[PDB]
Design a protein around this ligand. Sequence first.
Ligand SMILES: Nc1cncc2ccccc12
Lengths: 39, 156
Amino acid sequence: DMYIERAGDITWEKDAEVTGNSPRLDVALDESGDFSLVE
Amino acid sequence: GETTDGVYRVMTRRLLGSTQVGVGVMQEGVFHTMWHVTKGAALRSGEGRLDPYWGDVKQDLVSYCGPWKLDAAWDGLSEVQLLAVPPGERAKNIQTLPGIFKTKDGDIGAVALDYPAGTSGSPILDKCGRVIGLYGNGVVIKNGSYVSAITQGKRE
Ligand SMILES: Nc1cncc2ccccc12
């Protein structure tokens, strides 16, 4: 049996850590819901 | 059980200790997560039981107690926040400007942030604190790093 515990509110927090890039990627999505890189 | 809005850890005792398998969002009395996290199994909230209501393995989405409620969309311009919730660690906003999954059916927002698989189901928010989708389905790129879709469902 899986169970859930509350971990926070859903809020935008001003002055959060700002990271990660913004790639444009060619992907396909199969019948099983797995994405893959089209090349 | 607990039906207050907000973000929740999804836990199992079926392995060693208590293991976090994912995350989800309670809203309007409906729990929203990713299919690969629960496999459509029922969940406990203290004494309460949550039974699956809607699911789709292809969208990799599942709702409990009611229909999918989350209908906000990335606007294609603004930065967003991953409210990441990793195993053993406190909830932590992480602000980013999404990239793009280009597919034969359309373009989807993508967030380039790497976290353990137990983080799957963590919500992504716009500047008004509305959930524009969930983190944890995507792809591993040339580097070896992980890029997730902004996965959102349809509200009826
Ligand atoms: N870093 C990762 C590596 N492999 C699978 C993952 C699935 C969801 C989220 C992050 C992942």
